C-alpha positions as CSV (number, residue, x, y, z in Angstrom):
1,X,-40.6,-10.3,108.2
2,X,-37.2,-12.1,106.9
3,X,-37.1,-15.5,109.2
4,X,-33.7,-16.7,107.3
5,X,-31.3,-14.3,105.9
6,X,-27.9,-15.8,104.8
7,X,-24.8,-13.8,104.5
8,X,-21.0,-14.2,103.9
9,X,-18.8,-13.3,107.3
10,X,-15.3,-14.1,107.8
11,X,-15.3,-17.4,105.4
12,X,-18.2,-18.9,106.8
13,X,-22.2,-17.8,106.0
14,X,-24.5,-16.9,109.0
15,X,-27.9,-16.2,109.3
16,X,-28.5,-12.7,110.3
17,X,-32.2,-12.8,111.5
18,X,-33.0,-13.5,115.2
19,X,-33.7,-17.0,114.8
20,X,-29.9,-17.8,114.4
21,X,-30.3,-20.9,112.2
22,X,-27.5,-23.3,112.2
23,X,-25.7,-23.4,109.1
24,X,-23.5,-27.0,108.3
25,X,-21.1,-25.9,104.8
26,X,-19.8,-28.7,103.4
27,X,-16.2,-29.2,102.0
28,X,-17.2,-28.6,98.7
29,X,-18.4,-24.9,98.7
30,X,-16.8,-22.1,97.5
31,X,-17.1,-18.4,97.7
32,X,-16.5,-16.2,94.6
33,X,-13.2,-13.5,94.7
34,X,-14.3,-10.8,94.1
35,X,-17.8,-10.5,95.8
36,X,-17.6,-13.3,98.9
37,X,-21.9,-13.8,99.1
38,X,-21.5,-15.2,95.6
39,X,-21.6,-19.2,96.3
40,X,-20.8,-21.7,94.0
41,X,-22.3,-25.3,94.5
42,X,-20.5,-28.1,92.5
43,X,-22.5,-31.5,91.4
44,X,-19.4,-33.0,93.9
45,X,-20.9,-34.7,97.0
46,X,-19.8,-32.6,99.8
47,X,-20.8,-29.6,98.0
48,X,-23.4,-28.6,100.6
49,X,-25.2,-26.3,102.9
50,X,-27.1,-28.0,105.6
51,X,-29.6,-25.2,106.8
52,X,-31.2,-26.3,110.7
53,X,-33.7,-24.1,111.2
54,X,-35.1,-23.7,114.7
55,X,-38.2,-25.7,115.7
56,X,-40.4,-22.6,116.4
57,X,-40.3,-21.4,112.9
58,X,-40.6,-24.8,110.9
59,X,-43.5,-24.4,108.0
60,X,-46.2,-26.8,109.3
61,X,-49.7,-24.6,108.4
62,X,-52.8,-24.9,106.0
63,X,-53.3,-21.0,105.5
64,X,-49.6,-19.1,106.7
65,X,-48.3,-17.2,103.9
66,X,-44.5,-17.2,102.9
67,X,-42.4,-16.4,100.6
68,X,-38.7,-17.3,99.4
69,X,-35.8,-15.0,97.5
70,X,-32.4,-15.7,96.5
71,X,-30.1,-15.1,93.4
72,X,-28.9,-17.8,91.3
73,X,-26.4,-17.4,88.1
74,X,-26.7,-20.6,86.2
75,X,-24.3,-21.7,83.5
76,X,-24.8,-22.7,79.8
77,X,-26.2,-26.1,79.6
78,X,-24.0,-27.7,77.0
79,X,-24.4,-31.3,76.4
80,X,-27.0,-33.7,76.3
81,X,-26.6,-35.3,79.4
82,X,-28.4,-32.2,80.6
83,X,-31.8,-32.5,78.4
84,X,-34.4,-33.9,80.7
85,X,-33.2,-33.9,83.9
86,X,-34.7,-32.5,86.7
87,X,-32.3,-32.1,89.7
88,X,-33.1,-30.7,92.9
89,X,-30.8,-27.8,94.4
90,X,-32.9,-26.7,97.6
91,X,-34.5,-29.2,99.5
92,X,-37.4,-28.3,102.3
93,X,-39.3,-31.5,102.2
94,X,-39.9,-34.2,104.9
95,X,-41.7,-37.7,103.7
96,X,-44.0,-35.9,101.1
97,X,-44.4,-32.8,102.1
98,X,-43.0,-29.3,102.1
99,X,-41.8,-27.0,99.2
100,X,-37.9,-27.6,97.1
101,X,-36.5,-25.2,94.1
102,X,-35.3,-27.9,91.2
103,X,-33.9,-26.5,87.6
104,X,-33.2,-28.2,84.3
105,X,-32.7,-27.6,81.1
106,X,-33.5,-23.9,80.4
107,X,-36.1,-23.9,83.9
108,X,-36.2,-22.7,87.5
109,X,-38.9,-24.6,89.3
110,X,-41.1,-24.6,92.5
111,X,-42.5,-28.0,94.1
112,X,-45.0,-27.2,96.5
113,X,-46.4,-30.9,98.5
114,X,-49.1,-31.6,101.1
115,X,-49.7,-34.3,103.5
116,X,-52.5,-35.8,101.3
117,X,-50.5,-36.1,98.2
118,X,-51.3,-33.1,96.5
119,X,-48.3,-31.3,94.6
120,X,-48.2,-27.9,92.7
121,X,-45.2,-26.8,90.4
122,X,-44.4,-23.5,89.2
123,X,-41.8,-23.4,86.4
124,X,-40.0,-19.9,85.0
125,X,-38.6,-21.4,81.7
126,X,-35.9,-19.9,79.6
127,X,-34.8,-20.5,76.5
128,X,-31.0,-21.3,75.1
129,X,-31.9,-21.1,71.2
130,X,-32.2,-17.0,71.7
131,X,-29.5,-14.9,70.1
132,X,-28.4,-13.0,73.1
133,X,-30.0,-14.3,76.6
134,X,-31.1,-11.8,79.5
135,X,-30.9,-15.3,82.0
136,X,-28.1,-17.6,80.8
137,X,-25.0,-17.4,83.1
138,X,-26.2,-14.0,84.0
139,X,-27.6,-13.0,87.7
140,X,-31.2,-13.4,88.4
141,X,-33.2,-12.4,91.4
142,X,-36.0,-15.3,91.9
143,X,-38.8,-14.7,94.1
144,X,-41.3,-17.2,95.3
145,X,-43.9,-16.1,96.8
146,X,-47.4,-18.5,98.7
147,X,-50.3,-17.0,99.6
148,X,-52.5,-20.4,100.6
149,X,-56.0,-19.0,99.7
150,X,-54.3,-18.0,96.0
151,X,-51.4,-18.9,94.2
152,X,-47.8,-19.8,94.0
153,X,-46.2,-17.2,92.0
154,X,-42.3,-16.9,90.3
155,X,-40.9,-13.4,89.9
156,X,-37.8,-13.5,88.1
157,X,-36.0,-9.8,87.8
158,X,-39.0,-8.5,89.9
159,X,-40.9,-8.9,87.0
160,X,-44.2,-12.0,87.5
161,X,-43.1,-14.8,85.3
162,X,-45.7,-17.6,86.0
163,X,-48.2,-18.8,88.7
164,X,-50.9,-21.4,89.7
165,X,-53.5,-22.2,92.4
166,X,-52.6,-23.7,95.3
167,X,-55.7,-24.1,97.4
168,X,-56.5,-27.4,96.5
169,X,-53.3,-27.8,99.1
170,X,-53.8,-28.7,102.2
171,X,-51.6,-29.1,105.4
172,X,-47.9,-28.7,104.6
173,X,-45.4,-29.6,107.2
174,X,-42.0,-28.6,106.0
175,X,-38.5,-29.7,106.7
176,X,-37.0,-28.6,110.1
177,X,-33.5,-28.7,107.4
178,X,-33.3,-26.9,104.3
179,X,-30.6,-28.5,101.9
180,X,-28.7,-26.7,99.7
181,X,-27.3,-29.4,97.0
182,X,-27.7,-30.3,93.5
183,X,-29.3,-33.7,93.7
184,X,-30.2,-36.0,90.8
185,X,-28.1,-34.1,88.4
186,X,-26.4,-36.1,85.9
187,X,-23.5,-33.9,84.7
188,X,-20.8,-34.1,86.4
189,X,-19.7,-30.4,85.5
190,X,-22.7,-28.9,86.5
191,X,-22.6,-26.1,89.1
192,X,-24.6,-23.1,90.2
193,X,-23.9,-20.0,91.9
194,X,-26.4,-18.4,94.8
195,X,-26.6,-15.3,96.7
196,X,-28.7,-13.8,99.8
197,X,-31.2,-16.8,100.6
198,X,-33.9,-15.4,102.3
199,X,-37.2,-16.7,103.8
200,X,-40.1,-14.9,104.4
201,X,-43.0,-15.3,106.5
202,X,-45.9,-13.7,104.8
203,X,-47.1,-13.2,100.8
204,X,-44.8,-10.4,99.6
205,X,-46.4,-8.0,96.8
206,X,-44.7,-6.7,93.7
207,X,-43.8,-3.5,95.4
208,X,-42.0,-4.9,98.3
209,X,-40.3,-7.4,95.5
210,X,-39.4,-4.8,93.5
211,X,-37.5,-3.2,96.5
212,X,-36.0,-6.2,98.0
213,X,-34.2,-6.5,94.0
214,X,-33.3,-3.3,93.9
215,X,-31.5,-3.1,97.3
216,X,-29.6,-6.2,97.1
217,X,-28.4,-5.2,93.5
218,X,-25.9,-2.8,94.5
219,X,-27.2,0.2,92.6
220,X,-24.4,2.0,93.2
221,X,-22.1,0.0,91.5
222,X,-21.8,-0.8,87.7
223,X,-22.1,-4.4,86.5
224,X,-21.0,-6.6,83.6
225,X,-22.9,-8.6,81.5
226,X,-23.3,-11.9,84.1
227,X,-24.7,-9.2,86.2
228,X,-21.2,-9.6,88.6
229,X,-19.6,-6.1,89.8
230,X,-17.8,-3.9,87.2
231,X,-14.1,-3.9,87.5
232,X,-11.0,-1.4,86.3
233,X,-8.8,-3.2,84.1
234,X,-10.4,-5.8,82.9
235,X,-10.7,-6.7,79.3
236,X,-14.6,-6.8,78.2
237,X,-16.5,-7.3,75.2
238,X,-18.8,-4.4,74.0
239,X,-22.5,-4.9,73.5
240,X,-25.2,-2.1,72.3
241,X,-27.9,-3.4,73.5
242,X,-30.2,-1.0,70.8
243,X,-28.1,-2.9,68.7
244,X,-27.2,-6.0,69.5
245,X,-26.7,-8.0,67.0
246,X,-23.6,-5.8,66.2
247,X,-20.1,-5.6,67.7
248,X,-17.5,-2.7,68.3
249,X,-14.1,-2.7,65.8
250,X,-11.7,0.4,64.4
251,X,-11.0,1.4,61.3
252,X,-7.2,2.9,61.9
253,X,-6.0,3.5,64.7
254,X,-5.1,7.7,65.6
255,X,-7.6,11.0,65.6
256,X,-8.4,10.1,62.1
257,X,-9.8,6.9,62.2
258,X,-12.8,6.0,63.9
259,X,-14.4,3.1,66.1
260,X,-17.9,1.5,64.6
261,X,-20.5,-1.1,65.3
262,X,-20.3,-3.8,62.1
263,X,-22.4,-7.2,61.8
264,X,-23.6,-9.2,62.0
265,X,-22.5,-11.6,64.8
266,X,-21.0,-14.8,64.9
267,X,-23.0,-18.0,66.1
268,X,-22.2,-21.0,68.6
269,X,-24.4,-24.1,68.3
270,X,-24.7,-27.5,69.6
271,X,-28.0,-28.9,68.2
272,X,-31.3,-29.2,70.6
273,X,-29.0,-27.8,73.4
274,X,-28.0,-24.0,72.1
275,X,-28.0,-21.7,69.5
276,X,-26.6,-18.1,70.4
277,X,-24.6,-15.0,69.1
278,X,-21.5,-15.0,69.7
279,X,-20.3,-12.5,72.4
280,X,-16.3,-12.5,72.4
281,X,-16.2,-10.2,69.2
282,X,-14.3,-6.9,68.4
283,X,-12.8,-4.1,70.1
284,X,-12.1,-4.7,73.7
285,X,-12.5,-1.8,76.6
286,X,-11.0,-1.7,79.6
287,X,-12.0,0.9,82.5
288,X,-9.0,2.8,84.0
289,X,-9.2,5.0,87.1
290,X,-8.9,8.8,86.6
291,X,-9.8,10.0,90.1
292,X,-8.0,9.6,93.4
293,X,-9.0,7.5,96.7
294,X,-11.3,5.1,94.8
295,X,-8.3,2.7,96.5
296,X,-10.6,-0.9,95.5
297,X,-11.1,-2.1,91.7
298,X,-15.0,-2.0,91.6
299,X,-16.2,0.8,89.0
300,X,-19.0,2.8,90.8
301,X,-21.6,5.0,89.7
302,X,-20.7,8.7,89.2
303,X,-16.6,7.3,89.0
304,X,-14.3,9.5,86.8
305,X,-12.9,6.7,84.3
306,X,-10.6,6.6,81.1
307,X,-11.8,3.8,78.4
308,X,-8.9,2.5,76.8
309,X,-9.9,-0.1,73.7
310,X,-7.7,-2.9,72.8
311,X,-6.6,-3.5,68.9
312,X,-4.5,-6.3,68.0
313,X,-4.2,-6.7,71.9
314,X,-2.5,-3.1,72.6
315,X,-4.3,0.0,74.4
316,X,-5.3,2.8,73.1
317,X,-7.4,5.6,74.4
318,X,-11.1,6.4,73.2
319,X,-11.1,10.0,72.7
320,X,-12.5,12.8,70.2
321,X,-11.4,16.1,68.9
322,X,-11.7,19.3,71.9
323,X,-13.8,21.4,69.5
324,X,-21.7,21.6,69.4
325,X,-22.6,18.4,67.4
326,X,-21.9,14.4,67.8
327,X,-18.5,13.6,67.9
328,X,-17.0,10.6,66.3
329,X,-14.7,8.3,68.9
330,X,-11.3,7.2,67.9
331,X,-8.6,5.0,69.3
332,X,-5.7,7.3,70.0
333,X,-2.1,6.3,71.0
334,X,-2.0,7.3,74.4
335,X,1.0,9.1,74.4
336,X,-1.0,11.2,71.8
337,X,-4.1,11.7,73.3
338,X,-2.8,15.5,74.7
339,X,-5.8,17.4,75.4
340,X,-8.5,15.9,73.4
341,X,-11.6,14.9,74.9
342,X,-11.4,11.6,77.3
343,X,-12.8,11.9,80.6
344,X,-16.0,10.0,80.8
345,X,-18.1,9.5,83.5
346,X,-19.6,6.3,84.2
347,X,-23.3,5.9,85.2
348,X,-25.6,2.9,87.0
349,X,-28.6,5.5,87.5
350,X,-30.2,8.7,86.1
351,X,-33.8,5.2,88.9
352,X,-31.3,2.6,87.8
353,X,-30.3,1.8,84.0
354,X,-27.9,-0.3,82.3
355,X,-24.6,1.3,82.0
356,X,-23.8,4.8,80.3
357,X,-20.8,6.3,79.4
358,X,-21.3,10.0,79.9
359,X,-18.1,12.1,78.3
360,X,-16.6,15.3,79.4
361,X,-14.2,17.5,77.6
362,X,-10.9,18.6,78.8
363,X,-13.2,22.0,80.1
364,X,-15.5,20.1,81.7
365,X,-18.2,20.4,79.5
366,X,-20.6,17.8,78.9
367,X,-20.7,16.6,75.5
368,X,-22.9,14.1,76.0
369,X,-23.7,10.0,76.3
370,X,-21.6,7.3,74.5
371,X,-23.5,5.6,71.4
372,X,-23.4,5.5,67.6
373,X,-24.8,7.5,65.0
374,X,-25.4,5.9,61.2
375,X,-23.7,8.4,58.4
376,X,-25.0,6.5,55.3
377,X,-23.9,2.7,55.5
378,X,-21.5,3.0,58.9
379,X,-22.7,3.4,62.0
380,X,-19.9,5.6,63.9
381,X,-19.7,5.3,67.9
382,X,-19.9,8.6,69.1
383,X,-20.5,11.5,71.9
384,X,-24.2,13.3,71.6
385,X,-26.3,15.1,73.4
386,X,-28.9,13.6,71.5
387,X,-29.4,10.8,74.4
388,X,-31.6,12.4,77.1
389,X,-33.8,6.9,75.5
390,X,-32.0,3.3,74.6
391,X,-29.1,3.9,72.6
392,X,-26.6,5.0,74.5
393,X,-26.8,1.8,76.9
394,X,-23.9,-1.1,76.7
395,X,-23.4,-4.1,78.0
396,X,-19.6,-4.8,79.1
397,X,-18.8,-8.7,78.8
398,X,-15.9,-10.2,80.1
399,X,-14.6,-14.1,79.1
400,X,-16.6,-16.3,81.3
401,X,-16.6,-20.1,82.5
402,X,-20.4,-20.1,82.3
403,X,-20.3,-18.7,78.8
404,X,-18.3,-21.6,77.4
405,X,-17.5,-20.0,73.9
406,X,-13.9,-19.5,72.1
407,X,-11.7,-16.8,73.1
């Protein structure tokens, strides 16, 4: 039903649905490395993507239903330049009427206008006084959807954050030019990243929401923490997420010392603007290939892995003795590691779940899910068959401009 669908091709972004829509990038825009539909916007002038629809399919209805999708990845808002300011980032409004997407400090929001000067906002707010964020700098989907005998609602994740009534709204006649910009935004710094713009031209329901986020996640391939792809040899940042508030570290290095999850965390703060754990803490992993082909650098589900940690910024390899019960994880010299156990298979899905570390021995048998296991005050990492809910799930976190903390 999409009507606009904007993708990355050959340095430039088309629209892939039959209506062809012109699409005018400005100077300013940028396309990530590593995953080229990733757009960054800057608060720079030229910084834009001039969207010309075609005539035939320009919003000008009382009662047609339609509904927008994109992903956005929105940086820590660190200063006070950014309290109270409402800046728009896509425009679809001609005189006083059609609909534009604005954010500000810790919102997403949806303007909806008439031709009678009626207005509707929707607003997904988030909060930057949380100790660790599911939204800050991290992927969301957003879904708008307008059913014009109803509401406006705001999906965020697939998951219904917010909605109002909009049938006190009468004609809208939207913009023939849908302007992708940040306008109005005081902070020089400020940027924004976007992904897969799509319009729609009906009401979609939860069902066909929840499959539209689930089949431009990737679930095939494992992601970080922002919610970008899972990489080999990169340096990340562990997170439990059944215990978050704790971070990885090793006490002595060989078969007989042991890697645990100790707290609490750290805090950064800048007051009325953020208060947050701290995320670049302890024992760094990196993902190293085991299997051959797998020729690119993006870790995918069911890939044969080794998990090297990094102590006083060497690698060493995450292993446990070859010997039926949870086994402790130690940081082994890697010379060392002979045929203890290592292999570890790394999962996105059982249905989609965060990411699992699923270790093998040097026989091939399973010996179960990477997590922890609390002998009397210390809480070991280990490898049980005791997982299959929750605690076997981790959260890999590379240093990241959006973050803005120390490392």
């Amino acid at each position: 039903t999409s009507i606009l669908s904007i993708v990355y091709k050959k340095d430039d972004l088309i629209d892939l649905s039959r209506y062809g829509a012109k699409i005018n990038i400005g100077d300013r825009v940028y396309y990530d490395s590593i995953d080229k539909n990733q757009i960054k916007l800057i608060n720079l002038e030229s910084s834009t993507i001039e969207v010309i629809l075609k005539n035939a399919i320009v919003y000008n209805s009382m009662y047609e239903n339609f509904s927008t999708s994109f992903w956005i990845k929105i940086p820590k808002y660190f200063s006070k330049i950014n309290l109270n300011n409402e800046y728009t980032i896509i425009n679809c409004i001609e005189n006083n009427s059609g609909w534009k997407v604005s954010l500000n400090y810790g919102e997403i929001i949806w303007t909806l206008q008439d031709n009678k000067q009626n207005i509707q906002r929707v607003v997904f707010k988030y909060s930057q006084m949380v100790n660790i964020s599911d939204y800050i700098n991290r992927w969301m989907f957003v879904t708008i959807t307008n059913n014009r005998l109803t509401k406006s609602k705001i999906y965020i994740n697939g998951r219904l954050i917010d909605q109002k009534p909009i049938s006190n709204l009468g004609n809208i006649h939207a913009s023939n030019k849908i302007m992708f910009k940040l306008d109005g935004c005081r902070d020089p710094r400020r940027y924004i990243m976007i992904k897969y713009f799509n319009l729609f031209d009906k009401e979609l329901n939860e069902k066909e929401i929840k499959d539209l986020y689930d089949s431009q996640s990737n679930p095939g391939i494992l992601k970080d923490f922002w919610g970008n792809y899972l990489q080999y040899d990169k340096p990340y940042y562990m997170l439990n997420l059944f215990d978050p508030n704790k971070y990885v570290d090793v006490n002595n290095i060989g078969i007989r010392g042991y890697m645990y999850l100790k707290g609490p965390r750290g805090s950064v703060m800048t007051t009325n603007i953020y208060l947050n754990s701290t995320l670049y803490m302890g024992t760094k992993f990196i993902i190293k290939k085991y299997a051959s082909g797998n020729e690119d650098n993006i870790v995918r589900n069911n890939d044969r892995v080794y998990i090297n940690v990094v102590v006083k910024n060497k690698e060493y390899r995450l292993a446990t003795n070859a010997s039926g019960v949870e086994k402790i994880l130690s940081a082994l010299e890697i010379p060392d590691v002979g045929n203890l156990s290592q292999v570890v298979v790394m999962k996105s899905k059982d249905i989609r779940n965060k990411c699992k570390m699923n270790l093998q021995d040097n026989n091939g048998n399973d010996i179960g899910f990477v997590g922890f296991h609390l002998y009397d005050n210390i809480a070991k990492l280990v490898a049980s068959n005791w997982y299959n809910t929750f605690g076997c799930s981790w959260e890999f976190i590379p240093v990241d401009d959006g973050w803005g903390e120390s490392s």
